[PDB]
Amino acid sequence: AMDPEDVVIDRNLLILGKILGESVMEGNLKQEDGTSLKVAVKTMSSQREIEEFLSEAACMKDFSHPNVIRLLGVCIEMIPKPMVILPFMKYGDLHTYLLYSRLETGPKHIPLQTLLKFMVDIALGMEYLSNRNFLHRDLAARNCMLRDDMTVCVADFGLSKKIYSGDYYRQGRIAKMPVKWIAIESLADRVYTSKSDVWAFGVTMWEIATRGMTPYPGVQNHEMYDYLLHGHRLKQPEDCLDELYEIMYSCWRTDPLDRPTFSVLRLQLEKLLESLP
Ligand SMILES: Cn1cc(Nc2ncc(C3CN(c4nc5ccc(OCCC(C)(C)O)cc5o4)C3)nc2C(N)=O)cn1
Ligand SMILES: [Cl-]
Numbered sequence: 001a002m003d004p005e006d007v008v009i010d011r012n013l014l015i016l017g018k019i020l021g022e023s024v025m026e027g028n029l030k031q032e033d034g035t036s037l038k039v040a041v042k043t044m045s046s047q048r049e050i051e052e053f054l055s056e057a058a059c060m061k062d063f064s065h066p067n068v069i070r071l072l073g074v075c076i077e078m079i080p081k082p083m084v085i086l087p088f089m090k091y092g093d094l095h096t097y098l099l100y101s102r103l104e105t106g107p108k109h110i111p112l113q114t115l116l117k118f119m120v121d122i123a124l125g126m127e128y129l130s131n132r133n134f135l136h137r138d139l140a141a142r143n144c145m146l147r148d149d150m151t152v153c154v155a156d157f158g159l160s161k162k163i164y165s166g167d168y169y170r171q172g173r174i175a176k177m178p179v180k181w182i183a184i185e186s187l188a189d190r191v192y193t194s195k196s197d198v199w200a201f202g203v204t205m206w207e208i209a210t211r212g213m214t215p216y217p218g219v220q221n222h223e224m225y226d227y228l229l230h231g232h233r234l235k236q237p238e239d240c241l242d243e244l245y246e247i248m249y250s251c252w253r254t255d256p257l258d259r260p261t262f263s264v265l266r267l268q269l270e271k272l273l274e275s276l277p
């Protein structure tokens with residue numbers, strides 16, 4: 001296979017460890033020196049040219065923002081199967097972290113200002129992706145990672161789409177996306193815009209504010225489109241600042257043109273956080 005951007009890492013340099021999630025695995029990557037590096041490995045019927053997976057991975061390897069995960073490379077192993085090499089993040093995903101915090105043994109009770117800072121981190125990463133014409137298409141707390149220094153990075157770009165680029169071979173997976181994070185207009189035919197990500201960002205904010213609750217208690221996935229069509233939205237979480245709830249609600253306006261951009265959301269959240277004692 002041709003790799004013009006040199007994103008492929010030799011398969012012999014990678015040693016696969018335990019399963020982190022389901023798939024994501026732990027791994028050890030031998031560097032130029034005798035040293036080993038702890039990494040994570042993501043592995044994902046009519047398929048596109050593998051050269052395009054490598055080109056997309058090479059483009060993401062050039063992402064440089066503290067709130068966006070940075071791909072290390074791709075390892076190919078045999079029918080070639082690509083595996084994405086990522087920095088190892090021992091704290092894991094934000095969604096599980098929020099649930100663990102509601103246990104005596106988990107992280108301490110998360111202060112309201114730490115919850116807000118997690119949202120600022122995500123809006124900063126999304127502003128960076130949005131400005132580069134990337135649609136995440138799977139934004140949720142389970143797809144945000146906690147760095148060792150407790151800053152959040154947006155991650156899991158496996159089903160993302162650069163605006164105007166080809167997307168035929170992702171359609172089958174896009175059709176299976178969890179319905180409770182999808183914008184009302186994107187539910188009918190699974191067609192996404194930057195405003196679809198803004199809707200998902202509002203849902204993600206609500207997940208952070210509720211400390212990991214599943215969106216829309218009492219509403220089943222099959223009832224979701226009709227529920228939103230009737231104008232119903234996620235309810236204000238207990239102790240959620242009214243100002244914060246209004247920022248979340250602006251992400252779910254029926255007309256996508258009425259929702260704010262990530263730059264506006266980000267500034268609104270930074271100002272709200274600064275105003276707190
Ligand atoms: C229990 N536990 C779990 C951990 N750590 C983890 N758990 C889950 C993840 C997910 C898997 N990640 C992920 N971000 C990605 C971005 C891009 C990508 O492909 C782009 C190329 C192309 C478009 C062509 O597909 C694939 C990606 O996969 C976040 N990561 C870790 C970690 N990094 O350590 C600790 N404890
Ligand atoms: Cl992914």
Ligand SMILES: [Cl-]
Pocket residue numbers: 165166167168
């Ligand atoms: Cl296409």
Ligand SMILES: [Cl-]
Pocket residue numbers: 161190191192193
């Ligand atoms: Cl789309």
Ligand SMILES: [Cl-]
Pocket residue numbers: 215216217233234235
């Ligand atoms: Cl709700």
